[PDB]
Short mmCIF file of C-alpha atoms and ligand atoms in Angstrom, two decimals:
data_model
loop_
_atom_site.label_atom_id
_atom_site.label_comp_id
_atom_site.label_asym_id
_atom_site.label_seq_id
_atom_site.Cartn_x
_atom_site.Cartn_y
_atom_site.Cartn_z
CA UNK A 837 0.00 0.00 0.00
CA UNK A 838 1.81 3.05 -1.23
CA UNK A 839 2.65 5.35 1.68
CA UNK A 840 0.66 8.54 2.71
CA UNK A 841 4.21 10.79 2.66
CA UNK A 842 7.61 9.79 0.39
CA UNK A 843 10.96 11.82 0.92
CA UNK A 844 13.70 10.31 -0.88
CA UNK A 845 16.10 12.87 1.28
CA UNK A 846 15.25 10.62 4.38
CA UNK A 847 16.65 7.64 1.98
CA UNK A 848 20.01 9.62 1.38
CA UNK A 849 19.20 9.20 -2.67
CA UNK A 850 19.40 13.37 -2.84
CA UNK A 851 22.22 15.77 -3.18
CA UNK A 852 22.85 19.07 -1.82
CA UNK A 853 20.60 21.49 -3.92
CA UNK A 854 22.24 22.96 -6.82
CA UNK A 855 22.84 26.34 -8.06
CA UNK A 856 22.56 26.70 -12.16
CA UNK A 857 23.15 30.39 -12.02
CA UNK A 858 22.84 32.27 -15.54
CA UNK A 859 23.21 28.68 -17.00
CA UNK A 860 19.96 27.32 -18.60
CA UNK A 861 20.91 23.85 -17.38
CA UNK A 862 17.70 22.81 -15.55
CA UNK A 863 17.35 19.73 -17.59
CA UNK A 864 21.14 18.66 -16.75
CA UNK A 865 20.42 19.29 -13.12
CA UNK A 866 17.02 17.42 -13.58
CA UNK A 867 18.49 14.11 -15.09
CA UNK A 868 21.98 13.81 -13.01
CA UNK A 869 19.55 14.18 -9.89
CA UNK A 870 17.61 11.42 -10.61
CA UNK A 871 20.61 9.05 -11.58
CA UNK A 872 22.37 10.45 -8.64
CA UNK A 873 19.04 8.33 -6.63
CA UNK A 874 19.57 5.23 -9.12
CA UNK A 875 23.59 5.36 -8.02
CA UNK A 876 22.92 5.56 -4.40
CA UNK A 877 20.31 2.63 -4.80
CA UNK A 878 22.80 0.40 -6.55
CA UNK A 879 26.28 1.07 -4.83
CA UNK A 880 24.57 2.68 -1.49
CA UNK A 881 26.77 5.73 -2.09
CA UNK A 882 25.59 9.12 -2.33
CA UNK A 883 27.56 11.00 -4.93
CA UNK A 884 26.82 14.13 -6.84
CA UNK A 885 27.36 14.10 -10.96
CA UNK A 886 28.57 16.31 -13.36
CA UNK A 887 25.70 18.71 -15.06
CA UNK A 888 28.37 19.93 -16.42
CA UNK A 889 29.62 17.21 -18.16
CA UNK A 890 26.22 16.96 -20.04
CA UNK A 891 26.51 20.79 -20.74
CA UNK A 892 29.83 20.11 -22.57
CA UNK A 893 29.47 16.52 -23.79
CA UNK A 894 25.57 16.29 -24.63
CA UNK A 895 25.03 18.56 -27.83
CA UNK A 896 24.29 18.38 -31.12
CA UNK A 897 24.02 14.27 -31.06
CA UNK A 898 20.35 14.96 -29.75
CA UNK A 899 19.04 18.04 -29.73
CA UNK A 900 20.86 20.24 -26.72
CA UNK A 901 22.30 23.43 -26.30
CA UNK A 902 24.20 23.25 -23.49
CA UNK A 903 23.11 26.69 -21.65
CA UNK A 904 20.70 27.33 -23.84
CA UNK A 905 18.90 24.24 -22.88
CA UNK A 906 18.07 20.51 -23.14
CA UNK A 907 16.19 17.33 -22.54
CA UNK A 908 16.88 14.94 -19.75
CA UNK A 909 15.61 12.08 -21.96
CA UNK A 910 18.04 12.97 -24.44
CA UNK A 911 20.91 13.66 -21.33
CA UNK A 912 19.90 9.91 -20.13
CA UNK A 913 20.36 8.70 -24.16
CA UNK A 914 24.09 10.45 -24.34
CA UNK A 915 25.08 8.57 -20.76
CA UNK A 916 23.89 5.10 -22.24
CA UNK A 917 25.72 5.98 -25.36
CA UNK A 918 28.99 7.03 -23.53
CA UNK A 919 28.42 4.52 -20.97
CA UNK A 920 29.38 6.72 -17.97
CA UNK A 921 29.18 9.88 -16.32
CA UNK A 922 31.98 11.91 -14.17
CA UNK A 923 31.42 12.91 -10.51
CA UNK A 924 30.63 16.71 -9.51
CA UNK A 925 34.25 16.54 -7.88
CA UNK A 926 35.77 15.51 -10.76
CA UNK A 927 34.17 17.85 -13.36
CA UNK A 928 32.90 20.69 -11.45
CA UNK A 929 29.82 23.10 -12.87
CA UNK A 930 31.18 26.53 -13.93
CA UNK A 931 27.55 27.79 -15.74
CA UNK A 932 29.10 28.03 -19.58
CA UNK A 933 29.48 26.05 -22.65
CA UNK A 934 32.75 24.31 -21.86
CA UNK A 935 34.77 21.57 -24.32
CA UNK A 936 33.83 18.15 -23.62
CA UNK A 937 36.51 16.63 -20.74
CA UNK A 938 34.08 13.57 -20.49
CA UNK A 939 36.19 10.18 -20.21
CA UNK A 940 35.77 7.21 -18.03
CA UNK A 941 38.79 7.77 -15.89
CA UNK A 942 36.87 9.59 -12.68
CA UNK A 943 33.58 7.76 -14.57
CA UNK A 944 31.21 7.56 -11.29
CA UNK A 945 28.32 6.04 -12.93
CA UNK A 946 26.50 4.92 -16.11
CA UNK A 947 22.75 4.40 -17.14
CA UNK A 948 21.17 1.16 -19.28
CA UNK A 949 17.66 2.82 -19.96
CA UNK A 950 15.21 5.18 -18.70
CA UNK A 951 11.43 5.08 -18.96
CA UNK A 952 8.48 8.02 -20.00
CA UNK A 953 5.59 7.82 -17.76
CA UNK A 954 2.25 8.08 -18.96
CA UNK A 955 1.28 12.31 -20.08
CA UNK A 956 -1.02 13.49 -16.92
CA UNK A 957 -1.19 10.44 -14.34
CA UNK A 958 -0.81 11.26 -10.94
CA UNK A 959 -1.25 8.25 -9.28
CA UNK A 960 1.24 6.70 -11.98
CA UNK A 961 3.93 9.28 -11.13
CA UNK A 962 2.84 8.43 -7.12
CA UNK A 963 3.57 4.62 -7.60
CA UNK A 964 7.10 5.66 -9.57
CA UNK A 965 8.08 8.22 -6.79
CA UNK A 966 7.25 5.49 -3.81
CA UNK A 967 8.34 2.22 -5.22
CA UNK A 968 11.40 3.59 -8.41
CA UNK A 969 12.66 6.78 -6.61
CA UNK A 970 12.98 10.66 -7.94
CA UNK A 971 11.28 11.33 -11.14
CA UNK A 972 12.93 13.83 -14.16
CA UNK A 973 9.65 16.02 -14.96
CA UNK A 974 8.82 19.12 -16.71
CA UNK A 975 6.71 21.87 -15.08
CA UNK A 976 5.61 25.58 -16.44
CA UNK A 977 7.25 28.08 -14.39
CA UNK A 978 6.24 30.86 -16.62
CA UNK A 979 4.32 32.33 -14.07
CA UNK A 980 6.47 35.19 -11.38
CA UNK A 981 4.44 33.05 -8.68
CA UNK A 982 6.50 30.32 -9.11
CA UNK A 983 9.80 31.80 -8.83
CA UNK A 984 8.84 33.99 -5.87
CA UNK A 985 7.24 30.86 -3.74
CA UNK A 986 9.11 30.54 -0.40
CA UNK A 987 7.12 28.15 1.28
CA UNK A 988 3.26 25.82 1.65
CA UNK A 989 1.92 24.40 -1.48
CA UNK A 990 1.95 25.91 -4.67
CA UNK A 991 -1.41 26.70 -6.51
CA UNK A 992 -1.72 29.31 -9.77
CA UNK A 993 -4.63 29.48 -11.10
CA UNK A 994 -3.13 30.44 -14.47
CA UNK A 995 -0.67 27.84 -14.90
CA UNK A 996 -0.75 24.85 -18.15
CA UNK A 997 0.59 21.68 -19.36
CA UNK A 998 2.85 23.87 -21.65
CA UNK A 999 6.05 23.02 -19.25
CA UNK A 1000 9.34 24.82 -20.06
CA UNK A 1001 11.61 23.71 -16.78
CA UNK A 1002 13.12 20.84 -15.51
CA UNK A 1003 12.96 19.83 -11.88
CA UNK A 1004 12.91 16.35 -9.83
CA UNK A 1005 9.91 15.15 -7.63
CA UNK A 1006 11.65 13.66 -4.80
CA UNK A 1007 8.37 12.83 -2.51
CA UNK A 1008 5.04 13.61 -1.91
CA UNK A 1009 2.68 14.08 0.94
CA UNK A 1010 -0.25 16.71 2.36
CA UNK A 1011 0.47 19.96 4.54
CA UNK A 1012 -2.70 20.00 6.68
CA UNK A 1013 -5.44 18.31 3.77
CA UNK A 1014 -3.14 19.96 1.27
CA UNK A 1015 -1.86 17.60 -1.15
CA UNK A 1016 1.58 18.35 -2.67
CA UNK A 1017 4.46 16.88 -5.21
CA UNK A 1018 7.83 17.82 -3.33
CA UNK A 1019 10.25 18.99 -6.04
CA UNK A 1020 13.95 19.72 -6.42
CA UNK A 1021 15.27 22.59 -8.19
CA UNK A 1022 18.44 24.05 -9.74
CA UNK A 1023 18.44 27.80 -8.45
CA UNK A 1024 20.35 27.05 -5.31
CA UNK A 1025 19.46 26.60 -1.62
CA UNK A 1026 17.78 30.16 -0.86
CA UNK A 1027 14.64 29.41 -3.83
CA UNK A 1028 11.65 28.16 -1.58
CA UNK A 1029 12.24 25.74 0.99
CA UNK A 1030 15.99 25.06 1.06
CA UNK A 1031 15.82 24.83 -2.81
CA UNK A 1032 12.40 23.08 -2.90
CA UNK A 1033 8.75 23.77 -3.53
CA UNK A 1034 5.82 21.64 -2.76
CA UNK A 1035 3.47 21.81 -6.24
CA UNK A 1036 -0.58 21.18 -6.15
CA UNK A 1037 -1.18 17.30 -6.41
CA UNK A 1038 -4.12 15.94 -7.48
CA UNK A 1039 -5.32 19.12 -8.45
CA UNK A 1040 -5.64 18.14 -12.76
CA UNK A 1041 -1.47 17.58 -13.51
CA UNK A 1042 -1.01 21.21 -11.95
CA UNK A 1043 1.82 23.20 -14.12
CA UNK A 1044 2.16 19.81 -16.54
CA UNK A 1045 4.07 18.49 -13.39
CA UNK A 1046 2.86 14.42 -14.83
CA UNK A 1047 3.27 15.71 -18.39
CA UNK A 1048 6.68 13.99 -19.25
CA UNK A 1049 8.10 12.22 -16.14
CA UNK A 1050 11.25 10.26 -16.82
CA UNK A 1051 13.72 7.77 -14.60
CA UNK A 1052 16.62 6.04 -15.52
CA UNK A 1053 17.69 2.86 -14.52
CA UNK A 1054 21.11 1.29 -13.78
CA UNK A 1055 21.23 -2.47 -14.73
CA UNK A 1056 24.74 -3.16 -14.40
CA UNK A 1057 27.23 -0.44 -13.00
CA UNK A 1058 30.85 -1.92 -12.90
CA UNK B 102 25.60 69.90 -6.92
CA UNK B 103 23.15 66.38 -7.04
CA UNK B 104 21.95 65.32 -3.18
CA UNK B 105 24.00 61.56 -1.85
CA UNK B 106 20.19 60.23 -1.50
CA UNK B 107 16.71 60.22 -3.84
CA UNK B 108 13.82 58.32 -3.31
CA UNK B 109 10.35 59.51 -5.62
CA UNK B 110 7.99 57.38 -3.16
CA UNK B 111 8.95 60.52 -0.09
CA UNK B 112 7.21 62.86 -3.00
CA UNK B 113 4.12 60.81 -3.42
CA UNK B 114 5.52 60.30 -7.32
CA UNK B 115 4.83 56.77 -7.29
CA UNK B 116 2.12 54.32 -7.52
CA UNK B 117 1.30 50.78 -5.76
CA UNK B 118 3.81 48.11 -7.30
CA UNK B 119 2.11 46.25 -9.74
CA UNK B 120 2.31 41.75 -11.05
CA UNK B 121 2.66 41.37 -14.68
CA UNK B 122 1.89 37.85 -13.83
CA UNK B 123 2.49 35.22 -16.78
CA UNK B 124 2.50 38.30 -19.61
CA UNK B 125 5.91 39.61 -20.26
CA UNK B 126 4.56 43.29 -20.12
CA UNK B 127 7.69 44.29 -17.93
CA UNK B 128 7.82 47.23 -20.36
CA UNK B 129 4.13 48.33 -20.28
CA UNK B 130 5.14 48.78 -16.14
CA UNK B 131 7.97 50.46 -16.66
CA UNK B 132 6.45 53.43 -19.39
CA UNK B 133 3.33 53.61 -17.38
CA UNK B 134 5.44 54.11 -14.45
CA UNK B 135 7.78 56.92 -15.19
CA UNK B 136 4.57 59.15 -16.65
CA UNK B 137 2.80 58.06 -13.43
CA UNK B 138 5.43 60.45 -12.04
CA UNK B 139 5.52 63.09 -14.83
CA UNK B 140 1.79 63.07 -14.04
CA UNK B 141 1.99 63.65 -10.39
CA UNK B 142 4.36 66.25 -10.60
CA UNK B 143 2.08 68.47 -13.37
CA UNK B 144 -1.42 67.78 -11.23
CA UNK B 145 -0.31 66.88 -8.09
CA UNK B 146 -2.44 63.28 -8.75
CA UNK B 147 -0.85 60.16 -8.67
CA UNK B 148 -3.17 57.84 -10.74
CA UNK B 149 -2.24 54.29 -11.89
CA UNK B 150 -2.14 54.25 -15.47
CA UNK B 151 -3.09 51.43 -18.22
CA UNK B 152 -0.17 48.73 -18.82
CA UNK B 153 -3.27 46.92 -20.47
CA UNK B 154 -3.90 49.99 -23.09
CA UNK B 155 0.35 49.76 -23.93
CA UNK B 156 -0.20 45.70 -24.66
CA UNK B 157 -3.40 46.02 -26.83
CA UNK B 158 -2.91 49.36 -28.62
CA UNK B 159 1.04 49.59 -28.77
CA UNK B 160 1.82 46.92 -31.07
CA UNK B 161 3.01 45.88 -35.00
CA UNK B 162 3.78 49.47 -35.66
CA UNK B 163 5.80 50.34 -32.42
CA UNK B 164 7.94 47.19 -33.00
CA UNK B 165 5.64 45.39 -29.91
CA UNK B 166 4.50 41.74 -29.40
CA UNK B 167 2.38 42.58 -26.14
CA UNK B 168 3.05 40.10 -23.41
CA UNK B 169 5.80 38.80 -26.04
CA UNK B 170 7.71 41.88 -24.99
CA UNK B 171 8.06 45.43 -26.47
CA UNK B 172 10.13 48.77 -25.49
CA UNK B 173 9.27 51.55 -23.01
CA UNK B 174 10.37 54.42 -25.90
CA UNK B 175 8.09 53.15 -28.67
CA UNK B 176 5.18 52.91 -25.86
CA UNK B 177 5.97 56.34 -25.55
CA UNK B 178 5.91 57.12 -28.75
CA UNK B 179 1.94 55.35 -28.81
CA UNK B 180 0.76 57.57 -26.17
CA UNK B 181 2.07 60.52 -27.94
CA UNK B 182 0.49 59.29 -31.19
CA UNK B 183 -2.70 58.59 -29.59
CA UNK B 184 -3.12 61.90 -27.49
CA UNK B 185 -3.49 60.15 -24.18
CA UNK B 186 -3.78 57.10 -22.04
CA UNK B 187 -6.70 55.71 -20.10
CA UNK B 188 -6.36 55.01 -16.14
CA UNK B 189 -5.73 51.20 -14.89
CA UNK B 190 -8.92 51.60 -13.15
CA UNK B 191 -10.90 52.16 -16.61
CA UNK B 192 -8.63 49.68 -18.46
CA UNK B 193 -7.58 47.07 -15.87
CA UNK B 194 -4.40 44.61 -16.41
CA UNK B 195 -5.40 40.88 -17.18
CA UNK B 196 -2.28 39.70 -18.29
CA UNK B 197 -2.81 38.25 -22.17
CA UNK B 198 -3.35 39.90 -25.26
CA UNK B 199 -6.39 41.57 -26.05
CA UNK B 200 -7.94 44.01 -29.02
CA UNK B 201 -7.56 47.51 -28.69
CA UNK B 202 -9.98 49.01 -26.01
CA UNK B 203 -8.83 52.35 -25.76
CA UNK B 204 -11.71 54.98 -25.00
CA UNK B 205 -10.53 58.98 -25.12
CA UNK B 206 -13.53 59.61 -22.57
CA UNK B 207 -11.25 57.55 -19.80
CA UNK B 208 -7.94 59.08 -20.75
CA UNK B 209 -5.89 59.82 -17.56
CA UNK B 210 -2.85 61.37 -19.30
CA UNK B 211 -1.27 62.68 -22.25
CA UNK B 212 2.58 62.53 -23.21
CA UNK B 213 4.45 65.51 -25.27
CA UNK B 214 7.80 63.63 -25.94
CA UNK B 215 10.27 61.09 -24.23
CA UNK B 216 14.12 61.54 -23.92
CA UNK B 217 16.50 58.02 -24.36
CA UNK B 218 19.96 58.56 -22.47
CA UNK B 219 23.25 57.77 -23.45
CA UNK B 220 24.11 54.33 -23.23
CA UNK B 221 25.80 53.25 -19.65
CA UNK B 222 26.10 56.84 -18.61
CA UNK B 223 25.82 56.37 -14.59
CA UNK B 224 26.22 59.64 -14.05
CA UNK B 225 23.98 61.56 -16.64
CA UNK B 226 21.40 59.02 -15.03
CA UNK B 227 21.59 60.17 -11.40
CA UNK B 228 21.35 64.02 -13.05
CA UNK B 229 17.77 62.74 -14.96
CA UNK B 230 16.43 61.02 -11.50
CA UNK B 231 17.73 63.74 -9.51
CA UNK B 232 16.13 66.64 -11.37
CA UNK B 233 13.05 65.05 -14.06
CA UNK B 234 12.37 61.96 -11.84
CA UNK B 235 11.78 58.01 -12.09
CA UNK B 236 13.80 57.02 -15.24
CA UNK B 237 12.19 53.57 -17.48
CA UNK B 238 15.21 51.24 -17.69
CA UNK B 239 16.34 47.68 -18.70
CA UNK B 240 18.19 45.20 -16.80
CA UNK B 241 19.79 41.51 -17.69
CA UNK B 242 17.23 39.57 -15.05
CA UNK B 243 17.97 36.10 -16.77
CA UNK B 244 19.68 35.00 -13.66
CA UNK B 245 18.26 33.19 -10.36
CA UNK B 246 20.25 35.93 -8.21
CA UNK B 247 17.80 38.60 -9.58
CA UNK B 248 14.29 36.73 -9.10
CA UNK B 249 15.71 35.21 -5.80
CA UNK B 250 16.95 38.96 -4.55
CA UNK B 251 15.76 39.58 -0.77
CA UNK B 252 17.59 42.37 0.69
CA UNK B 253 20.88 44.61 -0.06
CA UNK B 254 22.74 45.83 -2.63
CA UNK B 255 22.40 43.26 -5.72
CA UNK B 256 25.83 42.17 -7.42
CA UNK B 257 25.98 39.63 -9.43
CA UNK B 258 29.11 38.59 -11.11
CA UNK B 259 27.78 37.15 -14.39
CA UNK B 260 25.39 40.21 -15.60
CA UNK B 261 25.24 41.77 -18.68
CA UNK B 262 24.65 44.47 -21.05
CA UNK B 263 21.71 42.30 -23.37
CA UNK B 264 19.04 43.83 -21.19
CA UNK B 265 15.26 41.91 -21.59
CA UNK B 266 13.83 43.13 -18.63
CA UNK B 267 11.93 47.10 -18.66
CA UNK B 268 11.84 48.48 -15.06
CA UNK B 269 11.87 51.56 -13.15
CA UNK B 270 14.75 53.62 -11.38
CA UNK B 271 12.90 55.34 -8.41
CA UNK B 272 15.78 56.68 -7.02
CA UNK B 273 19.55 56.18 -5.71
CA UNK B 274 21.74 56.01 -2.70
CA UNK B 275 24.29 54.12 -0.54
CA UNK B 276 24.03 51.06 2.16
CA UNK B 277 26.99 50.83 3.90
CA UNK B 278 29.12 52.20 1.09
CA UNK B 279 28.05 49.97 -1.34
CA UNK B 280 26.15 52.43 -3.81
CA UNK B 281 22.61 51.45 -5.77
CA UNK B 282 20.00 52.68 -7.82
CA UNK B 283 16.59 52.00 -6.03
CA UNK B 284 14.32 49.84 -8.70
CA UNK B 285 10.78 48.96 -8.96
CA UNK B 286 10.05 45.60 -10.21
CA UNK B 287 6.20 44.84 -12.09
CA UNK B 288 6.45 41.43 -9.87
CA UNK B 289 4.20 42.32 -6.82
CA UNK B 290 5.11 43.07 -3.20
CA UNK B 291 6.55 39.52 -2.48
CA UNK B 292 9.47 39.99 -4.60
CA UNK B 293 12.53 41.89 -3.31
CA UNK B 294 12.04 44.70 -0.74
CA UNK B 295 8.21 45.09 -1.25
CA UNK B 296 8.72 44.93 -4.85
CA UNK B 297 11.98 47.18 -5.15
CA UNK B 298 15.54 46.09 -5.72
CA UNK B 299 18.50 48.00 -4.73
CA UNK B 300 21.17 47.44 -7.56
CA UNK B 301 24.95 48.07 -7.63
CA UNK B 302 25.52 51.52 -8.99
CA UNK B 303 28.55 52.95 -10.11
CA UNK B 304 30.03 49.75 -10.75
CA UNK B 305 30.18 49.35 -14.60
CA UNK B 306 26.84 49.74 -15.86
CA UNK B 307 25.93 46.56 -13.98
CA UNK B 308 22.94 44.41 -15.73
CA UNK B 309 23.26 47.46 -17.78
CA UNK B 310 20.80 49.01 -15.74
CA UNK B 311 21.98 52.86 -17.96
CA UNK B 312 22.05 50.71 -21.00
CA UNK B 313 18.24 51.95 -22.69
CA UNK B 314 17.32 54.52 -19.91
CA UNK B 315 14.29 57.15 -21.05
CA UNK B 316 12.02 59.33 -19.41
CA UNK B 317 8.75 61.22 -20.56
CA UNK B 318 7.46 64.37 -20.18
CA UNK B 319 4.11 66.10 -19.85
CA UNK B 320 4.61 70.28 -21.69
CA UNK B 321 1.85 71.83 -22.86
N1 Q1Q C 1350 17.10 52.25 -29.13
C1 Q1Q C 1350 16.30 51.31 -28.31
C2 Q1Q C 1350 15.68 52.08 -27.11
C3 Q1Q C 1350 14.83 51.21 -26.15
C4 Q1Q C 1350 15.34 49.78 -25.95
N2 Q1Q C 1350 14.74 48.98 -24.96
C5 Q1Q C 1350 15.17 47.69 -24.72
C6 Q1Q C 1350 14.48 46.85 -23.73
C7 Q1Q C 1350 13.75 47.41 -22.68
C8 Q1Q C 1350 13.04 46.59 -21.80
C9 Q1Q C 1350 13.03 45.21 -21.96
C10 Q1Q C 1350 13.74 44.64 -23.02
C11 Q1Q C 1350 14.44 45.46 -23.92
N3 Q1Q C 1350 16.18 47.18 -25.52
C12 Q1Q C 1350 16.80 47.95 -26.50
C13 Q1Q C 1350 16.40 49.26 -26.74
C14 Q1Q C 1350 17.10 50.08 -27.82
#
């Protein structure tokens, strides 16, 4: 029976919040997040990965522009394709275009697939964030409401399916009846809570959050 | 000699912030803003004035996609052409694109002619908000540090000159040393200091806050 609250931060399968700066690199943040959970679940250790490295190193190949933005179905793709992925520590983020430096040498993990959710469900993105771990999604944060939030759940009335950043859902749960999708961000610790917001659940795929969910998956790591 | 301090909200010179919400009408605020205070100083009234009427009526001819964006000169330039401007009480913001539904009877002020600054002139700016009043700017606000701004002077590193954002220079002064222009944002109280953000001044056009700086005025 799928739990009433999920934080994956109680699990140790999240990161310190990231800070993207000028950088459009939301989708880089959004992917390496949720393979940094699919690491920790495989090896048990917690380590951040380069966004970086997929600014440099995932380009043209599929459809990215490096600060200019990205998928994080296409960032999973490149990290099958190269089979691996440096650490944070080894490749550090430094918000521009850089030359690739990808090679397997400080290689801290690799990905064999990832999976699309279905556009819109809910209670299928519930079942993936309790029972898979943190979820890639897109939400609409065209709306000045969204980057202002500081805290409580986030409701605007004006918001669509039309999603144009890339976050992680790393739980769920209710503040007082409130139902709520708790999601990691790229604009550093002092955005909302710590770096998160809590988005409307249940309440018709609020800001496209269940529009394109995506996880990857680790098979065999070496 | 200019005074060390100026703030246009001690002189009743300017209105309630305003939220642009989803429409990118940052440049609507910002024009209806600096006449708001070109208004108040001819009358004595400070009256809200129609971002709406800017982001219907200002458009293919003044180079102006509505809440696609637009500049604060060329919405100028509209008012001029049109004889006036209705009040945001007869015209009210909702935040998309509508028709034209500008009405003469509900004009709330006129506009003779606008003046654009020279480009990253920090000091010809301070003379313009010291002695016309609030000056329509731009500012680079494509990074977190601006939308996440809470309180002080606001450096950030990375800015630029490729300004996309139209705002409002209310006034200047220093905090703690560190000298700043005093801005109004169209993003509602919540953002900044009740809607205002104090950026670094004097310190190489930052954001390039003097980059596209005009004012209007009110003759005859
Ligand atoms: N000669 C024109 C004068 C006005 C102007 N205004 C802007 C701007 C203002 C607000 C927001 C985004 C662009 N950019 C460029 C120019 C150049």
């Amino acid at each position: 029976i799928l739990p009433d609250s999920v934080d994956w931060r109680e699990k140790g399968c999240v990161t310190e919040v990231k800070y993207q700066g000028s950088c459009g690199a939301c989708w880089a943040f959004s992917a390496v997040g949720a393979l940094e959970a699919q690491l920790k679940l495989k090896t048990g250790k917690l380590v951040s990965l380069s966004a970086q490295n997929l600014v440099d190193c995932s380009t043209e190949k599929y459809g990215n522009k490096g600060c200019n933005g990205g998928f994080m179905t296409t960032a999973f793709q490149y990290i099958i394709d190269n089979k691996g992925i440096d650490s944070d520590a080894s490749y550090p983020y430094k918000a521009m275009d850089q030359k690739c430096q990808y090679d397997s040498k400080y290689r801290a993990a690799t990905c064999s697939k990832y999976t699309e959710l279905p556009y819109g469900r809910e209670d299928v993105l519930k079942e993936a964030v309790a029972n898979k771990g943190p979820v890639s999604v897109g939400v609409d944060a065209r709306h000045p409401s969204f980057f202002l939030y500081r805290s409580g759940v986030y409701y605007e009335p004006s918001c669509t399916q039309n999603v144009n950043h890339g976050v992680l859902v790393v739980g769920y749960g209710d503040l007082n009846g409130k139902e709520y999708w708790l999601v990691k961000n790229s604009w550093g610790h002092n955005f909302g809570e710590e770096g998160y917001i809590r988005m409307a659940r249940n309440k018709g795929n609020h800001c496209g959050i269940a529009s394109f969910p995506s996880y990857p998956e680790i098979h065999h790591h070496h």
